[PDB]
Amino acid sequence: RCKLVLVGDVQCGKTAMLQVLAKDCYPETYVPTVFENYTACLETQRVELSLWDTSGSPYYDNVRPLCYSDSDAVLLCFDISRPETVDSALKKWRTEILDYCPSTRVLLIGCKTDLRTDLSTLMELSHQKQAPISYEQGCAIAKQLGAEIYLEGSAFTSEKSIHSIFRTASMLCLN
Amino acid sequence: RCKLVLVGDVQCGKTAMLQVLAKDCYPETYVPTVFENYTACLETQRVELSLWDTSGSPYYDNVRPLCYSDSDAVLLCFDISRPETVDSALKKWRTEILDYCPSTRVLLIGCKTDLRTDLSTLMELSHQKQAPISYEQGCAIAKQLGAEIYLEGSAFTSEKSIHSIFRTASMLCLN
Amino acid sequence: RCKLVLVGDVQCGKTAMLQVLAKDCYPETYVPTVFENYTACLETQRVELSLWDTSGSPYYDNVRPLCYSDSDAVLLCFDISRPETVDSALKKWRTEILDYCPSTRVLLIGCKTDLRTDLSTLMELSHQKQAPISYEQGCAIAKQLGAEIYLEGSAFTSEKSIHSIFRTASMLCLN
Amino acid sequence: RCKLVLVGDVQCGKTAMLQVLAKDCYPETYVPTVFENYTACLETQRVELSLWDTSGSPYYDNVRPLCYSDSDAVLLCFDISRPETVDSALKKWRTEILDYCPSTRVLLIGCKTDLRTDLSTLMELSHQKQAPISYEQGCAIAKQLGAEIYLEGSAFTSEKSIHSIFRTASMLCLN
Amino acid sequence: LIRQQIEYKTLILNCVNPDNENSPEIPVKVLNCDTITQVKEKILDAVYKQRPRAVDMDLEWRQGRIARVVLQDEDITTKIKRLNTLMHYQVSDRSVVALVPK
Amino acid sequence: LIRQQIEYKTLILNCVNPDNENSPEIPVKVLNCDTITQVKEKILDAVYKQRPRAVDMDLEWRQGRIARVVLQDEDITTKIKRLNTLMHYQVSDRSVVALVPK
Amino acid sequence: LIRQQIEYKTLILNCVNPDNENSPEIPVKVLNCDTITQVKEKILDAVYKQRPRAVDMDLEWRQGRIARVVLQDEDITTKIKRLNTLMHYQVSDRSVVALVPK
Amino acid sequence: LIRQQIEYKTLILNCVNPDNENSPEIPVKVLNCDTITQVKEKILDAVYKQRPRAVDMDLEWRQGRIARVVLQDEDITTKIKRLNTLMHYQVSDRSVVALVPK
Ligand SMILES: Nc1nc2c(ncn2[C@@H]2O[C@H](COP(=O)(O)OP(=O)(O)NP(=O)(O)O)[C@@H](O)[C@H]2O)c(=O)[nH]1
Ligand SMILES: Nc1nc2c(ncn2[C@@H]2O[C@H](COP(=O)(O)OP(=O)(O)NP(=O)(O)O)[C@@H](O)[C@H]2O)c(=O)[nH]1
Ligand SMILES: Nc1nc2c(ncn2[C@@H]2O[C@H](COP(=O)(O)OP(=O)(O)NP(=O)(O)O)[C@@H](O)[C@H]2O)c(=O)[nH]1
Ligand SMILES: Nc1nc2c(ncn2[C@@H]2O[C@H](COP(=O)(O)OP(=O)(O)NP(=O)(O)O)[C@@H](O)[C@H]2O)c(=O)[nH]1
Ligand SMILES: [Mg+2]
Ligand SMILES: [Mg+2]
Ligand SMILES: [Mg+2]
Ligand SMILES: [Mg+2]
């Protein structure tokens, strides 16, 4: 039994990951979360995961912290196609985790890796003086934060990539 | 090549059916449609279906009629757990179909048949002096309307039930 | 944590059910099982299910009994489209369960209920002086055997029907 | 309307790709094909694909050629984890294509790219004085053969990777 | 009569029937500026027309089948000392809530 | 200055770049009370700073990958004679639109 | 009596009922060394106890719902001149076949 | 030399490397008429060219990732007293097996 709480900016891909992991179902259309819980099971050692999905919105700053209680890890998520979400990770999310659960292990999770090869995303980033967050950059950001690991995937294109994130997360919590 | 347009009240289960048919994906969370198009293929004779999803809301009364053009059938949908949606079918939807595409064949489609065995739905209907629409009632309503057939299913519990609706719809349009 | 072992004649639909439950995947093509184990999780109370799939073949009469050990229930399966599999249930399977795990609760499970409306199956049964096993007949067979319950579903057409079998099975084992 | 025929060695991953594309279903267990046909639809321009799956076995050398008739492309498949299947591509499959459909465009398709990161596969290849076929190697093999393109994916881990192979295949056939 | 910059409004909460979950939820009218204690009092007045007291119960905010969080007058989210209200937590109109014995 | 009962507001439409679809959409400021002709004029002014004329083009309202409907000043949805506007069709802020040659 | 190195055996083919597909298939006993013409003759004898002739029909080997291939005495798979047999194509016992008018 | 009615044959078992599971399995030649004790002896001879003894270990027959059953000379499947063999359990050629400390 392992409790993981997912936090990170709005639309960064948290609910998409949990829906793929727990429901085998990808949400093309964005539905803003308030809070939710999923249950998944996987083998690393059978492990039952209780997965807490939270809103990335400031609107819910007062209820989201109530989800951190007794969590084995926080999954700090960001959208590799939007570097502003890495800024939030280093600032808003780091600060919130440190305010509410400072001793809890943090895993840094990149979402939407498929968008690294998406022409229109690439063109948009270029017009914004930006680029997609790379894997190497994710690892560096994890080091800077004190996150235990950087992991990434694509809920949209790789169901197994999401399974592997949570298998690895489960293994880190059991050791 | 067959063009089907789905119409019916808000939350009646239109988008859930198309997502199950075309995307193999069920939407637990309600996202209000504006309009959308799906493509599916099936064998009855290979048939390509262009499926138009429309908003059930009065809000979109001015754009939804633009979807009726050159449709081979209109699928008039209702929610078997909410008899008010049958009232709308006999009134708002009949009238709209007659105003915009009076010569187009109409198929009457019941959604959410699984809720006939759902205890909490049953209890709610009883407190409202209501009951679930039955299959026999669907057939009678189809007769009253002049719909060519009554078909029903459950997007939530039976992917094959949705496939069978559209297989039957495709066959009616080819003959 | 609940251990369920599935037994019943070859091709009766055991592996199809477990694949739908545990893997969200239906096997159209018959692959004969030797033995296998699946893990699923569901809510009734979180329950972890260890599901043992066994060969229905006499070929494996010597290894299949090794699967019965410490099981919370045996799911005795038959194919509603083939009454000979009900004969085996009352004879071979009853006798084997009584020889190897006589005190273990047995749930009687009908598979392939969708074939009750399949024209070609119906025509074949008629030419054989047979008919599909009905729900009412399943209940009667369960009574005759001393099975705790009769449950049925369709792995082919209803993923939720399989979920509901195991939810009910899990509840019977917890009470 | 586009007809594609898949050929390549036994167990190389042809049926797994078609099942993922057409059925949204991955076959963990190997079932040897004789021949089969799938229908899929996708947008590049709506395209209907008739997909012919063939046995990689010499056993069926006399029936498989009957599948080549009027095909818009042959998809010559190999298993990136087994370089012997690249040898067959350059020898048996090249020769068969040249004997039965020499003027038909050929697409070179690598299967099971996920096994490039699979520890046990890697260890096995090392003990055999082998290694996984790389993307760069696939491109080179395609050049050597006269194949129009090299494409690769993973039926096991990426449903979208298979979609993208066939989208690209459909586009090459329309131009 | 003047309206606030951040306006007060009534909300209906759908309170789970404590005797049986599958029964319809009980609608309870409350104010967004109600403290969690005042909310519990209103639910207890509506759901118990030997009554439990507000201090004997926790207010649970439910989402879907399993997810739930306990709301209270004071907790780690309080800004130092205003009592927490529904608007503090942003509880939406028609949210499903439950009263659970502490 | 008084506001309407049904208020007028500016909206941005994201117009597809006609030269290449995968390029970023072009934002065009319009009014919800703009007729479809006035909308097309504004898109043509913004997207063509030999120009096409408003009457040479259809306004397409896009949803997702494939779904699209043509909006015009007058069609089967017109109430008899007010010219159709964005608010008539309820085109939302930041909707994706395209100009397609008739 | 000696058996061949590559042995001859009887097989049953399940022939689709031509009048209605959803009716049970008709079992027809054949030999693996039967030429496709001899197979068609046997199906016509069994399925027509004005009969079609072997040369008027194609033998179709069916797999699942839609996939099918035409088998003939001579085609691109013939080795130069042995007539093609069931064993040439490796048609399995209980394979579904159909006779279709040329 | 005469062959049995039910013939004896050699089989290869793929034994899991005990030091690391992800390493290639170790092939061990055995007979289908070998008792489970004789099978364990052969695996121990091949996998340990302080050795464990046959009686110190259980033979595990593995299927896929997690499923496994223990095979022994005598158990609930024994017919009364022939020692259980590979053919008794119908262990197939190239089955994955493991030796696990009792
Ligand atoms: N290309 C791509 N898009 C993705 C991926 N995952 C999610 N998305 C897109 O991003 C949208 C938002 O994802 P979602 O998980 O709902 O966001 P969230 O992080 O839960 N946001 P919130 O905190 O507000 O609930 C989805 O609707 C989907 O369109 C992915 O892996 N790739
Ligand atoms: N029990 C059950 N619920 C269903 C079923 N189909 C849909 N629903 C529920 O009904 C909700 C609304 O369905 P949806 O198809 O989105 O509604 P819609 O008809 O498209 N509405 P709109 O016209 O406003 O877009 C879904 O979010 C889902 O929770 C079904 O078969 N059974
Ligand atoms: N119509 C229909 N066919 C089904 C259903 N479930 C399984 N089948 C069919 O029955 C075949 C055999 O099913 P399967 O579960 O593999 O059989 P099994 O009971 O595990 N047999 P074994 O004991 O030999 O492993 C499947 O290949 C599939 O074609 C169902 O619900 N409906
Ligand atoms: N790791 C991995 N394994 C795969 C993948 N695709 C298929 N496999 C494995 O390879 C096995 C054989 O695949 P399959 O497609 O059936 O083979 P085939 O090419 O059709 N062979 P045949 O020609 O004999 O019918 C599958 O049973 C599965 O276990 C993949 O993308 N990754
Ligand atoms: Mg979310
Ligand atoms: Mg909708
Ligand atoms: Mg099986
Ligand atoms: Mg195959």
- Bridge partners (DSSP) of residue B2 are B49
Contacts 24+ apart (CB under 8 A), H92-96: H92/C34, H92/H11, H93/H11, H93/H12, H94/H11, H94/H12, H94/H13, H94/H14, H95/H11, H95/H13, H95/H14, H95/H61, H95/H62, H96/H13, H96/H14, H96/H15, H96/H16, H96/H25, H96/H61, H96/H62, H96/H63
Cα A156 to ligand 1 centre (Å)? 9
Best residue among B7, B15, B57 to mutate for probing ligand 2, ranked by most atoms within 8 Å of CB? B15
Token representation of residue C122: 């119906």
- Bridge partners (DSSP) of residue E14 are E27, E96
CB atoms within 10 A of CB B124: 18
How far is H97 from B112, CA to CA, in rounded Å?
49
Cα B9 to ligand 6 centre (Å)? 9
How far is C153 from C13, CA to CA, in rounded Å?
10
How far is E70 from E89, CA to CA, in rounded Å?
11
Tell me the Ramachandran region of residue D130: left when phi exceeds 0, alpha when psi lies from -120 to 50, beta otherwise: beta
CB atoms D48 and B48 under 8 Å: yes
**Which strands, in side-by-side order, build the sheet including B35-43?**
B35-43, B46-54, B2-7, B73-79, B106-111, B149-152
Token representation of residue B45: 């004779």
Q: Residue B151: what residue type?
A: L
Domain that holds residue C161: 1-175
CB atoms within 10 A of CB G50: 3
Q: Tell me the three state secondary structure of residue D173.
A: helix
Cα A18 to ligand 5 centre (Å)? 9
Token representation of residue D107: 């697409």
Residues in C touching H74 (Cβ below 8 Å): none
In F7-73, the DSSP E strands lie at 10-15, 26-31, 57-63, 67-71
Give just the sign of the alpha carbon dihedral C139, C140, C142, C146. positive
Token representation of residue H33: 């008429």
* Domain count of the fold of chain H: 1
Contact D78, D88 (CB under 8 A): yes
How far is B118 from C118, CA to CA, in rounded Å?
26
Strands A149-152, A73-79: pairing kind: unpaired
Contact B25, A25 (CB under 8 A): yes
CB atoms D158 and A156 under 8 Å: no
**Which of B82, B78, B79 shows the shortest CA–CA distance to B131?**
B82
Q: Report whether residue A7 contacts ligand 1, using a CB cutoff of 6 Å.
A: no
For C35, which of H69, H71, H76 is closest by C-beta distance? H69
DSSP state letters, D38-61: EEEEEE--EEEEEEEEE--SGGGT
Q: Tell me the three state secondary structure of residue D36.
A: strand
Cα G66 to ligand 2 centre (Å)? 34
Q: Tell me the three state secondary structure of residue H82.
A: coil
Q: Report whether residue D14 contacts ligand 4, using a CB cutoff of 6 Å.
A: yes
Q: Report C:36-55 residues touching A (Cβ under 8 A).
A: 39-41, 43, 46, 48
Q: Which atom of ligand 2 is nearest to the CA of B55?
A: 23
* Domain count of the fold of chain B: 1
**Which of A81, A76, A87 shows the shortest CA–CA distance to A109?**
A76
Cα D126–chain centre separation:
25
Residue E95: which residues within 8 A CB-CB, separation 6 or more? E11, E13, E14, E61, E62
Resolution value, angstrom units: 2.0
Size of interface A-E (CB pairs under 8 A): 37
Distance from CA of D73 to the nearest CA of H (A): 36
How far is H41 from H31, CA to CA, in rounded Å?
12
Residues with CB under 6 A from ligand 2: B 10-16, 27-30, 32-33, 55-57, 111-112, 114-115, 154-156
CB atoms A41 and C48 under 8 Å: yes
DSSP state letters, chain A: -EEEEEE-STTSSHHHHHIIIIIS---SS----SEEEEEEEEE--EEEEEEEEE--SGGGTTTGGGG-TT-SEEEEEEETT-THHHHHIIIIIHHHHHHH-TTS-EEEEEE-GGGGG-HHHHHHHHHTT--PPPHHHHHHHHHHHT-SEEEE--TTT-HHHHHHHHHHHHHHHH-
Given CB atoms, is D24 within the 8 Å cutoff of chain B?
yes
**Which of A145, A137, A52, A154 shows the shortest CA–CA distance to A94?**
A145
Radius of gyration of chain E (CA): 14
Domain that holds residue E45: 1-102
**Which strands, in side-by-side order, build the sheet including E26-31?**
E26-31, E10-15, E96-101, E57-63, E67-71
What is the CATH number for F7? 3.10.20.90
Residue C147: which residues within 8 A CB-CB, separation 6 or more? C76, C106, C107, C108, C141
**Which strands, in side-by-side order, build the sheet including H57-63?**
H26-31, H10-15, H96-101, H57-63, H67-71
In this complex, the chains that touch G, judged by 3 or more CB pairs closer than 8 A, are C, D
How far is A112 from D75, CA to CA, in rounded Å?
30
Q: Report whether residue A30 contacts ligand 1, using a CB cutoff of 6 Å.
A: yes
Given CB atoms, is C25 within the 8 Å cutoff of chain B?
no
Given CB atoms, is A57 within the 8 Å cutoff of chain E?
no
Contact D77, D109 (CB under 8 A): yes
What is the CATH number for D55? 3.40.50.300
CB atoms within 10 A of CB B24: 16
